[PDB]
């Protein structure tokens, strides 16, 4: 029944609708392959000679993905609760607000998360980093290739200024696409560049030869290019557990809720990122 | 039943639809928190160690809002009334006109209101100022910070001319956003700039990195930046009282109507304003 | 029942839909004030002190409008009629044509009419001038002020050429707006400039402020600025009279029709016109 | 019943939908007047004096239009017929194709047709010229005025090059409109310029002050300006005769079909053309 | 019943919807003519003289098309199958994915296929070439004319650089259209240019005088111009044979499927291509 809530959350936010979310009933295994393209068409002599052998479309290679839990937990005083109850039919109003906050927090944790560690903190981490391992960290860790942090081997700051390595940013994206992406991945019909809020320069008209799209939260001075169906998140089906209760202590009612999730990029050779950009 | 009329008025005008209006049944208390965002997601060892404590989303800090009444009151002669009655089914026509006028007057009183005082006047105040305390005055009074009236400490005229402090206005909005707004408020997905009619320069295409929108009435040489859901108005539920009657004196029929309202900005750290702009 | 036909005629053409037309049952009196906006909100001590006095919204001042009749009259030969009677449902094919022509004639007579006089001529007046008094003539006659036609007192040819008084047109628009319109009328959600065809300069076409719009027929070298709901036409309800003849005269079936109308601007403070523009 | 087929054909193509087609039951007579505009409104003393006389809207002047027949006739082999029959429900497919071809051929014959002559040929006339008299030839023949083939009286090549008479083409269209069109035809609300494919220069954005539209086939170095309701075609109602039959000779099935049509421009003073343009 | 699946596949992808697919029940014969235009209208004396002879619209000239089979064949492990089955109603999900892959692979094989040969390979041919003969190869083989690989007779590299033959690409497309296309094919109302991904230069706004459209896979440094209804593919009706089965060997379930298809361009004189472009 958790799939109903998960699909509701996915529909609630636009960005998540462009991404896929699948429930896996086990804990640690191998991942489904969606963003794979190939030339499955062929022909061969089937009369007096060789025989035809098929070709997979799964591309399983070193995933060993494992899922961990995260929990959202909050509380409300009684005065605020009564003020909300004064609203006409606030039952839907509260639900929509909490759903929207959870959906936004998913992405905020996803894009710039790194180094999952117990006993998370919200003092030194305004943006939540140590809550789970993210897509960017997944690239930066599992495949140390296909990332441009250095230049070739001088200072590892890819600059675009006066003495810039790539004075024009479209030339940079062209070089990245032509160098660190597979040939039959070059001309894919739905490749998209993800960039933050500072590097926009006000123009989703076009960039290089690929459409652009921004996200709510994203590390500045960092860019990515991939299909908007490659990356995804997995959530264990029968692990969503919530409980609400009030306590006369400090006159509040609180709720706790926990799910088991893990971010995962399906294909590695489709999509590269760059970091440490100046200007 | 007043909520029906209030929602009708809100729907009648487009701008008010983008804003929220909630009925509070008490007079003076604490305010609901809507425009609040945070990283409620976390993780911590729940087996053999610490325990998890939730986190509020209310952010109550020094509101002490109090509501006052305002009343609209007018009259019509008999000749104009009969001429209106000559129209085919004018009953809806009159109602729509008065609703539109009330809705527009709400905003006109809201944006540039200051220093609520009894015995309002319409001679020295073409625009109504002393009718109620407005959002701009609320910022300028409750939080003396997050407002740029001076320069740093030379003349307090933020100029954009030849010897201008900010020759380019987009640089000004960038500086304001980066300086007087909270970090996790910087990249919010629905931040909007409010500007009057003179500072438009003909271009809602784009400004800086934020979309722009104008309002019917607004103080010239003044600009604001915030979410279009932060600010709001509160109206006491059981306080709307109206009465109509005719008097043979000077051959007229008049009506009086009074409501209890108060403008309120939900979050202060989300949204800053600037005043006294030259060119 | 004439109101049904009048409403059909109004709905037929687009420009007339943006304008208001009303049946008046009397002949000469005071006008209905639709397009006016005043701050009706206020507040005053009603306990131990003064009392609250309402505020009208009519602002009637020296209106004194008087209606006059105009009549249409035409005829068709039997040959053209028999040819028309060939289509499937020729009735609508004729009705829509005559309705559209009558509406176009209404607009033409409205915009550049002057000095109503009996025994109208169609030789010396290609465009119909002496048929009725138009909005432009109404401004030029009733309010001799609030019309910009001279320079200050040299030649009254407002030029925008090389040595022009206002080499840039939008500067002239801003000057006229800020010098001839009321303060609380300087900004309004629908203030629009009307201009002819030759003065368009190819750029509806977004202009600096007051988004422009053209009309079918309009005097060149003249411009107006007002709300598209300010001006209007009034028609006497029970005065529409038509009659048909099929005469054994030379060869024809003719028809005559007559209505009683009068053009009227609702408020003079909202809207100014400029004439005799060079270049 | 032919009107059903004619309306089907008119709806099939977009361009013909913007034009009118009327069935006339006689052969040679006078033409219906649609694209006529005038000031039918007037006023005159009907009490003690003159009487009011109506005004026609037919404008009959020297039409004497006469209709001639044209016939389409083709054939298909049996192999192609069976291959078509292999398609799923090809009965509609064949009909749509032949309707589209007939509709396109109507226009192709219309725009650049001249000098109707029996025994048409398809060797020396790739584009069909001698099939019927066209709109362009109708202007060039019936009204020798309102056409600019010469300059005033030097070489009759209206050039736009270096030593061009009209270096700017919009100036040319402005001059043509102001010179060879009637005054009350100048500002008509639906005037349109027709131009071929070579003179487009890639920009229906705007040209001069009139919208532009291209047609499938059109003589290069030729331009026209008129209302898209002035010109039209007439077709005799009870003259459409078709017959299909197969003949074992050369293994084919053929069909012949004949209609009686004639192109006609309604008003001459509304719309002028220019020819022999260089660059 | 195969037509249901074929139409489903055609609808699944947008590009194939703009193209036609017809089932032929024989193996090798003559092709249907769709993209043919002509002046079928004519006129001739049918009384006392010659007789009228119709004109074909088939244009059969040297097609001799022959169809060959291609087969798609793949397999899935059991773990991936169970993971897919965990999804809610994956039966449609798998079908949509395989349909999309087949549809894309059709085009990828079509545009840059050459020299059909048995025992296809996927090592030295990342893009599949020897699977079937494609449209480009069809032009380059059957009609050695209407292709610009050389210059006139210097180096056969049509360059656009500094010393370029055609410095401007629109001039190149204009020259190609005016030279290697038939006159009555020049002004066709739906001519379109096909270009790859590198030669886009970011601008489907417009190119030359024709609209542009890109395709997923296309040979770089190659361009084509034709109607989007000229080319097509033929598929034998009763030849689609598929079979699925599992084998405990290496724990997999596989499927094989074979169809009989052949690409074919309907008209040769409508549409030309150019290859070997520099810059």
CSV table of C-alpha atoms in Angstrom, one decimal, chain E:
chain,number,residue,atom,x,y,z
E,1,UNK,CA,-3.1,-9.2,-37.5
E,2,UNK,CA,0.4,-8.0,-37.9
E,3,UNK,CA,-0.9,-4.7,-39.1
E,4,UNK,CA,-2.2,-4.0,-35.6
E,5,UNK,CA,1.3,-4.3,-34.2
E,6,UNK,CA,2.9,-2.4,-37.1
E,7,UNK,CA,0.5,0.5,-36.6
E,8,UNK,CA,1.1,0.4,-32.8
E,9,UNK,CA,4.8,0.7,-33.4
E,10,UNK,CA,4.3,3.5,-35.9
E,11,UNK,CA,2.2,5.4,-33.4
E,12,UNK,CA,4.7,4.8,-30.6
E,13,UNK,CA,7.4,7.0,-32.2
E,14,UNK,CA,6.7,10.5,-33.5
E,15,UNK,CA,9.0,10.4,-36.5
E,16,UNK,CA,7.5,7.3,-37.9
E,17,UNK,CA,4.0,8.8,-37.7
E,18,UNK,CA,5.1,11.4,-40.3
E,19,UNK,CA,6.0,8.5,-42.6
E,20,UNK,CA,3.8,5.9,-44.3
E,21,UNK,CA,4.1,2.1,-44.0
E,22,UNK,CA,2.1,-0.2,-46.3
E,23,UNK,CA,1.9,-4.0,-46.3
E,24,UNK,CA,2.5,-5.7,-49.6
E,25,UNK,CA,1.3,-9.3,-49.9
E,26,UNK,CA,3.8,-10.3,-52.7
E,27,UNK,CA,7.6,-10.4,-52.5
E,28,UNK,CA,9.0,-8.4,-55.5
E,29,UNK,CA,7.1,-6.1,-57.8
E,30,UNK,CA,6.3,-2.5,-58.5
E,31,UNK,CA,5.9,0.3,-55.9
E,32,UNK,CA,2.9,2.5,-55.1
E,33,UNK,CA,3.3,6.1,-56.1
E,34,UNK,CA,2.2,8.6,-53.4
E,35,UNK,CA,4.4,11.7,-53.6
E,36,UNK,CA,3.5,12.6,-57.2
E,37,UNK,CA,2.1,16.0,-58.2
E,38,UNK,CA,0.9,17.1,-61.6
E,39,UNK,CA,-1.5,19.3,-63.6
E,40,UNK,CA,-4.2,16.8,-64.3
E,41,UNK,CA,-6.5,19.6,-65.3
E,42,UNK,CA,-6.9,20.2,-69.0
E,43,UNK,CA,-9.4,21.1,-71.7
E,44,UNK,CA,-9.8,20.1,-75.4
E,45,UNK,CA,-12.4,20.2,-78.1
E,46,UNK,CA,-14.7,17.2,-77.7
E,47,UNK,CA,-17.1,18.2,-80.5
E,48,UNK,CA,-15.8,17.7,-84.1
E,49,UNK,CA,-12.2,17.0,-83.6
E,50,UNK,CA,-9.8,15.3,-81.3
E,51,UNK,CA,-10.7,13.2,-78.2
E,52,UNK,CA,-9.4,13.6,-74.7
E,53,UNK,CA,-6.9,11.1,-73.3
E,54,UNK,CA,-6.3,10.8,-69.5
E,55,UNK,CA,-2.9,11.0,-67.7
E,56,UNK,CA,-1.6,8.5,-65.2
E,57,UNK,CA,-0.5,9.3,-61.7
E,58,UNK,CA,1.8,6.4,-60.9
E,59,UNK,CA,5.2,7.2,-62.4
E,60,UNK,CA,6.6,3.7,-62.5
E,61,UNK,CA,10.2,3.8,-63.5
E,62,UNK,CA,12.9,1.2,-62.7
E,63,UNK,CA,12.1,0.1,-59.1
E,64,UNK,CA,12.4,-3.7,-59.1
E,65,UNK,CA,12.3,-3.6,-55.3
E,66,UNK,CA,13.0,-6.8,-53.4
E,67,UNK,CA,12.4,-7.6,-49.7
E,68,UNK,CA,14.7,-9.4,-47.2
E,69,UNK,CA,14.2,-10.4,-43.6
E,70,UNK,CA,15.7,-9.1,-40.5
E,71,UNK,CA,15.3,-10.6,-37.0
E,72,UNK,CA,15.6,-9.2,-33.5
E,73,UNK,CA,16.5,-11.6,-30.8
E,74,UNK,CA,17.3,-11.2,-27.1
E,75,UNK,CA,17.2,-12.7,-23.6
E,76,UNK,CA,16.8,-11.9,-20.0
E,77,UNK,CA,18.1,-13.6,-16.8
E,78,UNK,CA,15.7,-14.8,-14.1
E,79,UNK,CA,16.8,-12.3,-11.4
E,80,UNK,CA,16.1,-9.3,-13.7
E,81,UNK,CA,12.8,-10.9,-14.7
E,82,UNK,CA,11.7,-11.2,-11.0
E,83,UNK,CA,12.8,-7.7,-10.3
E,84,UNK,CA,10.6,-6.5,-13.2
E,85,UNK,CA,7.8,-8.6,-11.9
E,86,UNK,CA,8.0,-6.8,-8.5
E,87,UNK,CA,6.8,-3.7,-10.3
E,88,UNK,CA,3.1,-3.1,-10.2
E,89,UNK,CA,1.7,-4.4,-13.5
E,90,UNK,CA,4.9,-4.6,-15.4
E,91,UNK,CA,3.2,-6.4,-18.3
E,92,UNK,CA,2.6,-3.1,-20.1
E,93,UNK,CA,6.0,-1.7,-19.0
E,94,UNK,CA,8.1,-4.4,-20.7
E,95,UNK,CA,6.0,-4.2,-23.9
E,96,UNK,CA,6.4,-0.4,-24.2
E,97,UNK,CA,10.1,-0.6,-23.7
E,98,UNK,CA,10.7,-3.3,-26.3
E,99,UNK,CA,8.4,-1.5,-28.7
E,100,UNK,CA,10.3,1.7,-28.3
E,101,UNK,CA,13.7,0.0,-28.8
E,102,UNK,CA,12.5,-1.7,-31.9
E,103,UNK,CA,11.1,1.5,-33.3
E,104,UNK,CA,14.3,3.4,-32.7
E,105,UNK,CA,16.4,0.6,-34.2
E,106,UNK,CA,14.3,0.7,-37.3
E,107,UNK,CA,15.3,4.3,-38.0
E,108,UNK,CA,18.9,3.7,-36.9
E,109,UNK,CA,19.2,0.8,-39.4
E,110,UNK,CA,17.4,2.8,-42.1
E,111,UNK,CA,19.2,6.1,-42.4
E,112,UNK,CA,22.8,4.9,-42.5
E,113,UNK,CA,22.5,1.3,-43.8
E,114,UNK,CA,24.4,0.0,-46.8
E,115,UNK,CA,25.4,-3.3,-48.5
E,116,UNK,CA,23.0,-5.9,-47.0
E,117,UNK,CA,25.0,-9.0,-46.2
E,118,UNK,CA,24.4,-12.2,-44.3
E,119,UNK,CA,26.0,-12.9,-41.0
E,120,UNK,CA,25.8,-9.3,-39.6
E,121,UNK,CA,28.3,-8.3,-37.0
E,122,UNK,CA,28.1,-5.9,-34.0
E,123,UNK,CA,31.9,-5.6,-33.2
E,124,UNK,CA,33.2,-3.5,-36.2
E,125,UNK,CA,29.7,-2.0,-36.8
E,126,UNK,CA,28.6,0.0,-33.7
E,127,UNK,CA,26.0,1.6,-35.9
E,128,UNK,CA,24.5,-1.2,-38.0
E,129,UNK,CA,25.4,-0.9,-41.7
E,130,UNK,CA,25.3,-4.3,-43.4
E,131,UNK,CA,21.8,-5.1,-42.0
E,132,UNK,CA,19.8,-3.7,-44.9
E,133,UNK,CA,20.1,-1.2,-47.7
E,134,UNK,CA,19.1,2.3,-46.7
E,135,UNK,CA,17.6,5.4,-48.3
E,136,UNK,CA,20.9,7.2,-48.6
E,137,UNK,CA,22.5,4.1,-50.2
E,138,UNK,CA,19.4,3.8,-52.4
E,139,UNK,CA,20.0,7.3,-53.8
E,140,UNK,CA,23.8,6.8,-54.0
E,141,UNK,CA,23.3,3.5,-55.9
E,142,UNK,CA,20.2,3.5,-58.1
E,143,UNK,CA,20.4,7.1,-59.3
E,144,UNK,CA,24.1,8.1,-59.5
E,145,UNK,CA,22.9,11.6,-60.5
E,146,UNK,CA,21.3,14.0,-58.1
E,147,UNK,CA,24.1,13.9,-55.6
E,148,UNK,CA,26.9,16.4,-54.9
E,149,UNK,CA,30.0,14.6,-53.7
E,150,UNK,CA,32.4,16.4,-56.0
E,151,UNK,CA,32.6,20.1,-56.8
E,152,UNK,CA,31.8,20.3,-60.5
E,153,UNK,CA,36.5,18.9,-60.7
E,154,UNK,CA,38.9,19.7,-57.9
E,155,UNK,CA,38.9,18.0,-54.5
E,156,UNK,CA,35.6,16.4,-53.7
E,157,UNK,CA,35.2,18.2,-50.3
E,158,UNK,CA,32.3,20.7,-50.4
E,159,UNK,CA,33.8,23.2,-47.9
E,160,UNK,CA,32.2,26.2,-46.2
E,161,UNK,CA,35.3,27.6,-44.4
E,162,UNK,CA,37.5,30.6,-45.4
E,163,UNK,CA,38.2,29.4,-48.9
E,164,UNK,CA,34.9,27.7,-49.0
E,165,UNK,CA,32.9,26.9,-52.1
E,166,UNK,CA,29.7,27.9,-50.4
E,167,UNK,CA,30.7,30.2,-47.5
E,168,UNK,CA,27.0,30.4,-46.5
E,169,UNK,CA,25.0,27.2,-46.1
E,170,UNK,CA,21.7,28.7,-47.1
E,171,UNK,CA,23.3,29.6,-50.5
E,172,UNK,CA,24.3,25.9,-50.7
E,173,UNK,CA,20.8,24.6,-50.1
E,174,UNK,CA,19.4,27.2,-52.6
E,175,UNK,CA,21.9,26.1,-55.2
E,176,UNK,CA,21.1,22.4,-54.6
E,177,UNK,CA,17.3,23.0,-54.8
E,178,UNK,CA,17.6,25.1,-58.0
E,179,UNK,CA,20.0,22.7,-59.7
E,180,UNK,CA,19.2,19.1,-58.8
E,181,UNK,CA,15.4,19.2,-58.3
E,182,UNK,CA,12.7,19.2,-60.9
E,183,UNK,CA,11.1,22.6,-61.7
E,184,UNK,CA,7.6,21.6,-60.7
E,185,UNK,CA,9.1,20.0,-57.6
E,186,UNK,CA,10.8,23.3,-56.6
E,187,UNK,CA,7.9,25.0,-54.9
E,188,UNK,CA,6.3,22.0,-53.2
E,189,UNK,CA,4.4,23.0,-50.0
E,190,UNK,CA,6.0,20.4,-47.7
E,191,UNK,CA,9.7,20.2,-48.7
E,192,UNK,CA,11.9,19.6,-45.7
E,193,UNK,CA,15.6,19.4,-45.0
E,194,UNK,CA,17.0,16.5,-43.0
E,195,UNK,CA,20.3,17.2,-41.1
E,196,UNK,CA,22.2,15.4,-38.3
E,197,UNK,CA,23.2,16.7,-34.9
E,198,UNK,CA,26.5,18.4,-35.6
E,199,UNK,CA,25.5,20.7,-38.5
E,200,UNK,CA,22.6,22.2,-36.5
E,201,UNK,CA,24.5,25.2,-35.1
E,202,UNK,CA,21.5,25.5,-32.6
E,203,UNK,CA,19.2,27.0,-35.3
E,204,UNK,CA,13.7,24.3,-36.3
E,205,UNK,CA,13.3,28.0,-36.6
E,206,UNK,CA,14.3,28.2,-40.3
E,207,UNK,CA,17.1,27.5,-42.7
E,208,UNK,CA,17.4,28.9,-46.2
E,209,UNK,CA,13.7,28.9,-47.1
E,210,UNK,CA,12.8,25.5,-45.8
E,211,UNK,CA,12.0,24.2,-42.3
E,212,UNK,CA,14.5,21.9,-40.7
E,213,UNK,CA,14.1,18.8,-38.5
E,214,UNK,CA,16.7,16.5,-36.9
E,215,UNK,CA,16.6,12.8,-36.4
E,216,UNK,CA,18.0,10.6,-33.6
E,217,UNK,CA,20.8,9.0,-35.6
E,218,UNK,CA,22.2,10.4,-38.9
E,219,UNK,CA,25.6,10.4,-40.6
E,220,UNK,CA,27.4,13.6,-39.8
E,221,UNK,CA,28.7,15.7,-42.7
E,222,UNK,CA,25.6,14.7,-44.7
E,223,UNK,CA,22.4,16.5,-45.6
E,224,UNK,CA,19.2,15.6,-47.5
E,225,UNK,CA,16.2,17.5,-48.8
E,226,UNK,CA,12.9,15.9,-49.8
E,227,UNK,CA,9.3,15.6,-48.8
E,228,UNK,CA,8.6,13.8,-45.6
E,229,UNK,CA,6.2,11.6,-47.5
E,230,UNK,CA,8.4,10.5,-50.3
E,231,UNK,CA,10.5,7.8,-48.6
E,232,UNK,CA,8.9,4.8,-46.9
E,233,UNK,CA,9.4,1.2,-45.8
E,234,UNK,CA,7.5,-1.9,-47.0
E,235,UNK,CA,6.8,-4.9,-44.8
E,236,UNK,CA,5.5,-8.3,-46.0
E,237,UNK,CA,2.2,-9.0,-44.3
E,238,UNK,CA,2.3,-12.7,-43.5
E,239,UNK,CA,6.0,-13.0,-42.6
E,240,UNK,CA,6.3,-11.8,-38.9
E,241,UNK,CA,7.2,-14.9,-36.9
E,242,UNK,CA,8.2,-14.9,-33.2
E,243,UNK,CA,8.9,-17.5,-30.6
E,244,UNK,CA,9.9,-17.3,-26.9
E,245,UNK,CA,11.3,-20.0,-24.7
E,246,UNK,CA,13.5,-20.5,-21.6
E,247,UNK,CA,16.5,-22.7,-21.3
E,248,UNK,CA,18.0,-23.8,-18.0
E,249,UNK,CA,21.4,-23.3,-19.7
E,250,UNK,CA,22.9,-20.2,-18.1
E,251,UNK,CA,19.5,-19.5,-16.4
E,252,UNK,CA,17.9,-17.4,-19.1
E,253,UNK,CA,14.7,-16.9,-21.1
E,254,UNK,CA,15.1,-15.8,-24.7
E,255,UNK,CA,13.0,-14.8,-27.7
E,256,UNK,CA,13.5,-14.6,-31.4
E,257,UNK,CA,11.4,-12.6,-33.9
E,258,UNK,CA,11.7,-12.1,-37.6
E,259,UNK,CA,10.1,-9.8,-40.2
E,260,UNK,CA,10.5,-9.2,-43.9
E,261,UNK,CA,11.1,-5.5,-44.7
E,262,UNK,CA,12.6,-3.3,-47.4
E,263,UNK,CA,13.2,0.4,-47.5
E,264,UNK,CA,12.0,2.2,-50.6
E,265,UNK,CA,12.0,5.8,-51.9
E,266,UNK,CA,8.9,6.5,-54.0
E,267,UNK,CA,10.1,9.3,-56.3
E,268,UNK,CA,13.7,9.9,-57.2
E,269,UNK,CA,13.4,13.4,-58.8
E,270,UNK,CA,12.0,14.8,-55.6
E,271,UNK,CA,14.8,15.0,-53.0
E,272,UNK,CA,18.6,15.3,-53.3
E,273,UNK,CA,21.4,14.7,-50.8
E,274,UNK,CA,24.9,16.1,-50.3
E,275,UNK,CA,27.8,14.4,-48.5
E,276,UNK,CA,31.3,15.2,-47.4
E,277,UNK,CA,30.8,18.7,-45.9
E,278,UNK,CA,33.6,20.5,-44.1
E,279,UNK,CA,32.8,22.9,-41.3
